[PDB]
RNA sequence: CUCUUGGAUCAGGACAUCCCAAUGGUGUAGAAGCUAUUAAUGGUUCGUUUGUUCAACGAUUAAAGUCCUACGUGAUCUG
């Protein structure tokens, strides 16, 4: 069972009425247009009809890199390499102009933000534009790719070593000295896993929130 | 002691009677909201037509939030959403007593508790049958779309495409500084500067020998009324008495604010086309759509855009 | 956002901006209202001891959802008259050129890719 | 910067009687049904709240003898006798805590 | 019948009556002719105000 | 601005405030009963409530192992939640705490006091406040509108 | 024969107007300009010293105005 990160609600003082509305919006278009389930580190391919030209369509094909947003403002961002030149594009699913999205390679990685690829080599972030989809088992749990990409030369765009990144698809070994993760792990903040009121627990709404989407269909 | 104490509904209510008397007030609100119902057989007040120049009266409502939205070209708008609950007119003045050339209507909105109010609103509210309101305004109302009071009022008052005006308190923030209520520079950080970062300069010229009214100076910022104008409304919802304006309102969410049509020069009477005395369900001449909409708007469920 | 001083790359054929020089090459005004540039902006480039003018095509700022965002600052050399001065270019460059307010289309027809 | 002249009595006086300054009345002043002292009504009971906070440290001083020592924390539920009272058969196998003294009538 | 008052001479047009908001720029001048057209009884009153003893009685 | 802010500022800084709270909780869990400053106690019982609901999780549970060992110091008393605490707040959803104000610190500070305890414990019992009987004269006419209205429809 | 000013911050005000606005004359064909009348509305940029006795240079702008307010302003800061 994938419940979509989108439909589980933020905590705050919001009225549920405003969810019930929203709701309602995003799956009339879910039923126009269907949105396949995937993960951050799965590769896909999305078709959009381009503005600015009359009629003509566009297609991009990258890693997902990060899932974020709630309701009807939902996006992910997806990443390539051409020419030697990166790119991301940062896409809504609910925007009206999205004609198709395939999920080339499903798949998940260790981590649920890759924002580090940047930072690593580029093979690590190339992916093939004409591939072609691979096979899929119903009978079988998502796989888990467990790769540890390698880095460039220290100054980077963020800190990763540090603990509150909590990064464990790098390989640190090589790129950095015992001593430098010591000098890392006086930021760590230990007790904040601990504290039970920091921890916001949703199995009930996701049960609920299961059933009257399958009620629906 | 022969003195004075004070008191609370909770003091004396036993376990039973506790219990007991929270059920008989919910009781009685709902018998008050549905005996006001149906106001056109309730010997209501004549209806002129519409004439140049005229006003019309408006609502109250409840700020629950923002979402996106999309037009038949891609653009897409944030929009805010505003909730009519409970909206009633409760008392008129003619134009004489008002003071002002045009009349007044008083509304209100948003049902509340009836416990922790003074006597003196409860005996107002009990004189016209309702339960009392959170908050009341007032409204310009020409003679012709005066409407009698406890009539109650739905969000169908407002249709798609006309633009409206809507204002409210803002967010409280406190005593500030000169650097963020003003948005003064400041001074630098380095290079030898004195506990001197954030302050203001000078106030004035030394010649005046004091210091002008009006001079900006920290103080307590936020929690002010403001009006924002020309919101167009994209959308209603009958069902649920939803209005979709454009762009942000001032507040915080769950917060009351006050519609009506806009004053600015261009949109001067616009009107006509709209209900002219306000919107009647009890007539019940044909039932409404669940959801109205603008033809810019690009609905859901729609087939996907292509810019050919 | 490219401002006074900053350090851009010169995505061209061009022979001024493909030799190798010591020195890369730096932004010296910007033909704007405010100082920021973005796409579709021209600016006053410092090359080789020289003065050329240049316009911006990607750069590494987020700007609204679905346009793409580069790893790199990239710019193209442009004559004082406005035409080219190189003749080609391979890396991929935006479609929002096209209707955005300005004169593009001498740049577009040199350009093989748009993404 | 140092005062330019000395405050009247007059100036003074104004300052620091203003009704803002002096001590407000209370109105939330009750007594107490079982001891007949005074409370407040949000509040509980003093001298009540005493005599069961003596009893508490009565039988805590009790409980300490009994476990001898540190982290001997039992693992099953505790229970309190008075002379004069036995264990009842829903009272097998808890900690039993021994009063000289008899039941007090609020102890229920 | 205070609007119905008379100026001998160039007097509606010549004569200026000041005052201040107390703001910076807030000092406004404005003739005879335009105060009279605004409040009809501001004339009269206002020459009755200067000819009384200035202390406290006069209000 | 503290808008939204669910915490309150304790010792000196974020981690002593844990701390002090773990040290509250520990002597709630080994006495039931305990006195500390309004504030103080007041900031502990959201964390007295949701150790009871590890607890009903049970011994075997890894997870429900490592919070109770993080958030009780002393080693004697993990048994004790999970085998006599848990045990008795099996029916109820929550509400295993109850908490009252205390008449003011007679030490030259004058802080306002609190106890808190666990609901079901063998101590004498508080001197709780009592709602009015409904022989009082406001009771029965209230009474008395009740029984009209329910037998008359 | 000799011997207090800068900058930062925040600005109050004058019109003898630099830009924006309404007009007259022309050795005003159009486009540019030169001159005069009326008006204080808001605005009036960013870097740099090889030579220059209270100067100059680079890139721009619709414009980069002239002045008064004990250097306007050091119990707000600083060379
Ligand atoms: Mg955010
Ligand atoms: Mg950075
Ligand atoms: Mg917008
Ligand atoms: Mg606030
Ligand atoms: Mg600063
Ligand atoms: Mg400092
Ligand atoms: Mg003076
Ligand atoms: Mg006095
Ligand atoms: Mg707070
Ligand atoms: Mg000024
Ligand atoms: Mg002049
Ligand atoms: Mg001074
Ligand atoms: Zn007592």
Same mark, same amino acid.
């Given at each position: 069972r994938f419940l979509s990160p989108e439909f589980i609600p933020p905590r705050g003082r919001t009225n549920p009425l405003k969810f019930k509305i929203e709701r309602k919006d995003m799956l009339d278009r879910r039923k126009v247009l269907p949105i396949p389930e995937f993960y951050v580190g @799965?590769?896909?391919?999305?078709?959009?009809?381009?503005?600015?030209? +009359?009629?003509?369509? +566009? #297609?991009?094909?990258?890693?997902?890199?990060?899932?974020?947003?709630?309701?009807?403002?939902?996006?992910?961002?997806?990443?390539?390499?051409?020419?030697? #030149?990166?790119?991301?594009?940062?896409?809504?699913?609910?925007?009206?102009? *999205?004609?198709? *999205?395939?999920?080339?390679?499903?798949?998940?990685?260790? &981590? &649920?933000?890759?924002?580090?690829?940047? &930072?690593?080599?580029?093979?690590? @972030?190339?992916? &093939?534009?004409?591939?072609?989809?691979?096979?899929?088992?119903?009978?079988?749990?998502?796989?888990?790719?467990?790769?540890?990409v390698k880095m460039k030369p220290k100054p980077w765009s963020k800190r990763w070593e540090r603990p509150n990144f909590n990064i464990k698809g790098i390989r640190f070994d090589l790129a950095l000295t015992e001593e430098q993760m010591k000098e890392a792990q006086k930021w760590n903040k230990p007790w904040i896993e601990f504290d039970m009121m920091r921890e916001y627990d949703t199995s009930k709404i996701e049960a609920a929130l299961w059933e009257e989407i399958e009620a629906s269909k | 002691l022969h003195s004075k104490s004070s008191t609370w509904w909770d003091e004396h209510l036993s376990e039973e009677n506790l219990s007991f008397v929270k059920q008989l007030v919910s009781d009685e609100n709902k018998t008050q909201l549905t005996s006001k119902l149906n106001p056109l057989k309730d010997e209501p007040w004549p209806l002129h037509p519409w004439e140049p120049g005229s006003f019309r009266v408006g609502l109250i409502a409840l700020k629950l939030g923002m979402m996106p939205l999309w037009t038949k070209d891609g653009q897409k708008h944030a929009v805010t959403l505003l909730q009519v609950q409970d909206c009633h007119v409760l008392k008129y003045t003619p134009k004489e007593d008002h003071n002002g050339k045009i009349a007044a209507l008083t509304v209100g909105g948003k049902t509340v508790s009836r416990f922790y109010k003074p006597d003196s609103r409860l005996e107002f509210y009990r004189d016209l049958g309702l339960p009392p309101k959170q908050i009341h305004k007032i409204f310009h109302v020409t003679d012709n779309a005066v409407i009698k009071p406890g009539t109650p009022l739905?969000?169908?008052?407002?249709?798609?495409?006309?633009? %409206?005006? %809507?204002?409210?308190?803002?967010?409280?923030?406190?005593?500030?500084?000169?650097?963020?209520?003003?948005?003064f520079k400041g001074q630098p950080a380095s290079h030898g500067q004195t506990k001197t970062h954030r302050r203001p300069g000078a106030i004035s010229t030394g010649d005046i020998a004091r210091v002008w009214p009006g001079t900006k100076m920290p103080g307590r910022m936020g929690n002010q009324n403001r009006t924002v104008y020309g919101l167009k409304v994209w959308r209603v919802n009958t069902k649920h008495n939803i209005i979709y304006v454009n762009g942000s309102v001032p507040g915080h969410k769950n917060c009351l604010v006050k519609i009506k049509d806009s004053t600015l020069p261009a949109y001067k009477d616009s009107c006509k086309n709209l209900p002219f005395p306000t919107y009647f369900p009890d007539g019940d001449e044909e039932e409404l759509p669940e959801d109205l909409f603008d033809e810019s708007v690009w609905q859901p469920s729609e087939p996907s855009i292509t810019f050919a | 956002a490219?401002?006074?001083?900053?350090? =851009?790359?010169?995505?061209?054929?061009?022979?001024?901006? !493909?030799?190798?020089?010591?020195?890369?090459?730096?932004?010296?005004?910007?033909?704007?209202?405010?100082?920021?540039?973005?796409?579709?902006?021209?600016?006053?480039?410092?090359?080789?001891?020289?003065?050329?003018?240049?316009?911006?095509?990607?750069?590494?700022?987020?700007? !609204?959802?679905?346009?793409?965002?580069?790893? !790199?600052?990239? =710019?193209?050399?442009?004559?004082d008259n406005g035409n080219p001065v190189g003749t080609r270019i391979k890396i991929p460059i935006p479609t929002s050129l096209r209707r955005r307010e300005g004169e593009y289309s001498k740049v577009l027809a040199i350009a093989q890719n748009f993404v | 910067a140092a005062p330019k002249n000395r405050r009247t009595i007059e100036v003074n006086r104004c300052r620091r009687r203003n009704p803002?300054?002096?001590?407000?009345?209370?109105?939330?002043?009750?007594?107490?049904?079982?001891?007949? /002292?005074?409370?407040?009504? /949000?509040?509980?009971?003093?001298?009540?709240?005493?005599?069961?906070?003596?009893?508490?440290?009565?039988?805590?001083?009790?409980?300490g003898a009994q476990e001898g020592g540190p982290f001997r924390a039992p693992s099953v539920e505790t229970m309190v006798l008075y002379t004069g009272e036995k264990p009842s058969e829903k009272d097998q196998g808890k900690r039993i805590v021994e009063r000289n003294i008899k039941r007090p009538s609020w102890f229920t | 019948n205070t609007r119905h008052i008379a100026f001998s001479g160039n007097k509606w047009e010549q004569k200026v009556y000041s005052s201040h908001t107390g703001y910076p720029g807030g000092f406004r001048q404005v003739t005879a002719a335009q105060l009279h057209r605004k409040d009809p009884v501001a004339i009269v009153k206002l020459a009755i105000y200067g000819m009384l003893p200035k202390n406290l009685h006069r209000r | 601005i503290s808008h939204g802010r669910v915490y309150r500022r304790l010792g000196l800084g974020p981690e002593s405030r844990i701390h002090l709270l773990r040290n509250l909780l520990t002597g709630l869990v080994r006495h039931e009963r305990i006195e500390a400053t309004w504030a103080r106690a007041d900031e502990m019982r959201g964390y007295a409530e949701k150790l009871i609901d590890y607890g009903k999780l049970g011994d075997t549970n890894e997870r429900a192992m490592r919070m109770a060992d993080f958030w009780l110091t002393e080693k004697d008393l993990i048994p004790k939640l999970f085998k006599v605490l848990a045990p008795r707040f099996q029916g109820q959803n929550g509400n295993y705490t109850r908490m009252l104000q205390i008449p003011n610190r007679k030490e030259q500070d004058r802080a306002k006091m609190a106890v808190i305890e666990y609901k079901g414990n063998y101590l004498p019992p508080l001197p709780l406040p009592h709602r009015d009987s409904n022989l009082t004269l406001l009771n029965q006419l209230l009474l008395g509108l009740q029984q009209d209205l329910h037998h008359n429809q």
């Open positions: @799965s590769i896909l391919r999305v078709t959009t009809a381009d503005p600015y030209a +009359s009629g003509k369509t +566009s #297609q991009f094909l990258g890693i997902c890199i990060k899932r974020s947003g709630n309701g009807l403002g939902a996006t992910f961002t997806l990443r390539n390499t051409i020419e030697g #030149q990166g790119v991301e594009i940062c896409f809504e699913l609910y925007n009206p102009r *999205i004609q198709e *999205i395939q999920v080339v390679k499903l798949e998940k990685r260790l &981590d &649920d933000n890759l924002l580090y690829l940047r &930072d690593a080599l580029p093979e690590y @972030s190339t992916f &093939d534009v004409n591939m072609k989809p691979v096979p899929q088992e119903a009978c079988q749990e998502v796989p888990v790719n467990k790769l540890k | 739905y969000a169908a008052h407002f249709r798609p495409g006309q633009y %409206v005006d %809507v204002t409210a308190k803002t967010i409280g923030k406190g005593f500030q500084g000169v650097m963020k209520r003003w948005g | 490219v401002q006074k001083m900053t350090r =851009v790359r010169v995505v061209d054929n061009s022979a001024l901006g !493909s030799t190798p020089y010591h020195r890369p090459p730096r932004c010296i005004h910007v033909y704007n209202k405010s100082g920021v540039g973005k796409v579709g902006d021209q600016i006053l480039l410092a090359i080789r001891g020289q003065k050329k003018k240049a316009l911006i095509v990607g750069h590494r700022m987020p700007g !609204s959802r679905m346009t793409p965002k580069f790893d !790199s600052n990239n =710019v193209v050399l442009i004559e | 803002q300054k002096l001590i407000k009345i209370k109105n939330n002043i009750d007594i107490c049904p079982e001891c007949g /002292h005074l409370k407040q009504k /949000h509040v509980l009971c003093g001298y009540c709240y005493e005599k069961v906070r003596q009893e508490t440290t009565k039988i805590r001083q009790q409980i | - | -």
